[PDB]
Symmetry: D2
């Protein structure tokens, strides 16, 4: 599997830092530090990955969540990243993400941002 | 907070069943059973929620992930749901989701489905 | 085809009004009036639809765009709706949408909202 | 405005070709040729852009639609791209997109792909 390939420190195009441990069972646990937004220091993350991916050259599906509350700040929001790990000399995690803020019902139509992050080991 | 409001069994518009425990610290843990797709029985989920939401009538941001591997099937894919819990007499979890499949690099452009699920307690 | 089924006035869950003419060639032209956001009166829309859909009970794919500039306001943003028309006694257009604002490069990560609108004829 | 900056031929990361004319009034018209998918030759596109963007360094919001029917093929689907044009020496159009296929109601949950394309003039 890709437990060893996924475990470690990853960096996205914004300079954010994603530190993760992949468990043998499919668990992802770690911390996230965003270079942008209403965020400071590390936030807990948890997620899941496919611990027995296909053997045909396909990537490894995974996802995780951060709720943007820690001991320093609370942005009343959560981001989920959904994507796939691609191994090899220039390994990457290619993701799309959804960032939902708590809103009133009147403002729920503008609650959710969407974007895409690519994580590398360098 | 909404630990007690979120903890329990939820059902979406497709007939899927979302069983979750909210921890005092922001953790979400539980199981998901999809009424649709290449899925059978329960799958592990994990996520996060805002354990100290705003007090102005806003919803409570949260997200979770399921990797679609269990002891029965492996769809080589993962879904993340990002959304907000809205309390009250007809409590709901309103979500948008991203479902990424592991793909070859040539097919990565068609790796990710997007949709929206509303969960109720009934 | 669904030229006659799509042409006319549609209303979404927010109270917005979508007035459209479907051309024999796949064109969509009309106006949109949003019940929410930094918007007033009607805005031009244009789009495309599948003018020869499948005959197996599938919906009819379509999409359109509004740039949120008219003679009254300019929100420096554009929404695209992507979805499908479903005919019958309770015809609907089920959509997902992406609303991008012009931003500086530093803020591009938070440029795009995502949501979902359902349009009915009533 | 950016009528002259947007008008012309653009290429994305997949090798697709986007040929567009921007009108003084906010119109986008042209053709799209996809390097991937169930697509051959050129397809009509139409969209809208902000013809009076902010002057603070922000990008120019725009969107367009392609229904994937032409004289050669019909994929019973439509893509909308929502994004912003960024001018300068290395001008770009940064987009996110939604690709909806016509589906039966039972399959509507898996009707829509999401992705991101960056277009350059080179
Ligand atoms: O590494 C990274 N960093 C970024 C990406 C995805 S997570 C993100 C880092 C997130 C850090 C905590 N939230 C914020 O600061 C934040 C700032 C502004 C907005 C929101 C959140 C938000 O919810 C929102 C929702 C709906 C309409 C508008 C808005 C906003 O205007 N990748
Ligand atoms: O309760 C629920 N159930 C559903 C929603 C969101 S999770 C979903 C249940 C998911 C169950 C496991 N996956 C599947 O069966 C599955 C079936 C078909 C496709 C995919 C996955 C997929 O990745 C995909 C990605 C890119 C292009 C096309 C495709 C597919 O054509 N809410
Ligand atoms: O009928 C409808 N009405 C609505 C939906 C989809 S179109 C929408 C109506 C749109 C009317 C013109 N824009 C706005 O007022 C507007 C207001 C607030 C925001 C934005 C735009 C925006 O871009 C944005 C982008 C990124 C981060 C945060 C933000 C915002 O906070 N369906
Ligand atoms: O330049 C480009 N090219 C690409 C991107 C965005 S447009 C795209 C080019 C599109 C060309 C016409 N459609 C296709 O061939 C096509 C192929 C496979 C699928 C679909 C469409 C689809 O709807 C879909 C929807 C829901 C679940 C699964 C599926 C598919 O598995 N940028």
């Amino acid at each position: 599997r890709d437990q060893a390939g996924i475990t470690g420190t990853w960096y996205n195009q914004l300079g954010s830092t994603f530190i993760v441990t992949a468990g043998a069972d499919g668990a992802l646990t770690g911390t996230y530090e965003s270079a942008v937004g209403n965020a400071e220091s590390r936030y807990v993350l948890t997620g899941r990955y496919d611990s027995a991916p296909a053997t045909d050259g396909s990537g490894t599906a995974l996802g995780w969540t951060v709720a943007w509350k820690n001991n320093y700040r609370n942005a009343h929001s959560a981001t989920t990243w959904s994507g796939q790990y691609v191994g090899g000399a220039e390994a990457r995690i290619n993701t799309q993400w959804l960032l939902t803020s708590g809103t009133t019902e009147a403002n729920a139509w503008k609650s959710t941002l969407v974007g895409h992050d690519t994580f590398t080991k360098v």
